[PDB]
């Protein structure tokens, strides 16, 4: 139980029972815990995303202006509660504690020639065009792309 060997591209979560704070331990590493601490589960794979695919993770980590994971003072991680975030192809990231993988690795959809997509703005945002897309607007995404 005390001996923890994380394979390459895996992770675990371990519970500091002196603080009730959990965190992720990644790497091709061996891990040695303490007596208070408790590894939650057997080491699972850092989930990876191929090209022309995506996934959505509920409750994403708040990262800074450079993408460094922001933490609480108490050792806990700064999430963004009840959001989603769509992740594209990149290195096999881990999942910080308090994150659920809702959409799996699903393919980016291809629209054929002479066919288009009907798209609705669920929530207000600001697109790359410069338009204040109010929630409820309708879209025509046409093309063979």
């Amino acid at each position: 139980e005390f001996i923890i060997r994380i394979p390459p591209y895996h992770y675990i979560h371990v519970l500091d029972q002196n603080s009730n704070v959990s965190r992720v331990e990644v790497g091709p590493k061996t891990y040695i815990r303490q007596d208070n601490e408790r590894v939650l589960f057997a080491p699972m794979r850092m989930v990876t995303v191929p090209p022309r695919h995506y996934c959505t993770v509920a409750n994403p980590v708040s990262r800074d202006a450079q993408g460094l994971v922001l933490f609480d003072v108490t050792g806990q991680v700064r999430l963004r509660h009840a959001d989603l975030e769509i992740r594209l192809a990149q290195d096999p990231f881990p999942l910080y504690p308090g994150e659920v993988l809702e959409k799996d690795i699903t393919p980016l959809q291809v629209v054929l020639p002479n066919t288009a997509l009907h798209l609705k703005a669920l929530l207000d945002f600001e697109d790359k065009d410069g338009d204040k897309v109010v929630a409820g607007d309708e879209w025509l995404f046409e093309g063979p792309g």
């Binding site: 054929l112 020639p113 002479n114 066919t115």
Partner: protein, 136 residues
């Protein structure tokens, strides 16, 4: 030993089409996702009758070519096959490249063989639940 006369009992008034052994529900819910409503109420019934008539013609050609014997037009059922082929060859020109855009195959020969179930269906294709939802 397929029903032959029972098909002509279900022959429509213009030349359009159990006796088929295919998931009807599942095919309609499959075509509902792809955007058949945007072709007009009149248009979607014409397209569904086109696909059903092509399915009946592919079933007939499969029945014939097991014994070896748009171009398909037995002497006793030659009239219905002739008028069905003439109904096919008229309204097909309204829809160029419709089987790729509806995600059914390259052309109608590739589409009806997959929908009938005698030819394999790839994993990159979403036509896997048209034969297996009837298996559940």
């Amino acid at each position: 030993a397929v029903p032959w006369t029972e098909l002509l009992s279900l022959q429509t008034e213009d030349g359009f089409w159990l006796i088929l052994n295919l998931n009807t529900n599942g095919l309609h819910s499959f075509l509902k996702q792809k955007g058949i409503q945007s072709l007009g109420v009149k248009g979607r019934e014409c397209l569904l009758d086109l696909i059903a008539t092509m399915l009946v013609l592919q079933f007939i050609r499969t029945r014939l070519e097991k014994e070896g014997i748009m171009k398909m037009d037995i002497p006793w059922a030659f009239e219905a096959i002739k008028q069905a082929s003439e109904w096919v060859r008229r309204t097909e020109g309204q829809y160029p490249s419709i089987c790729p855009r509806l995600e059914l195959g390259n052309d109608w020969d590739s589409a009806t063989k997959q929908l009938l179930g005698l030819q394999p269906i790839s994993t990159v294709s979403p036509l896997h639940r048209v034969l297996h939802y009837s298996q559940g």
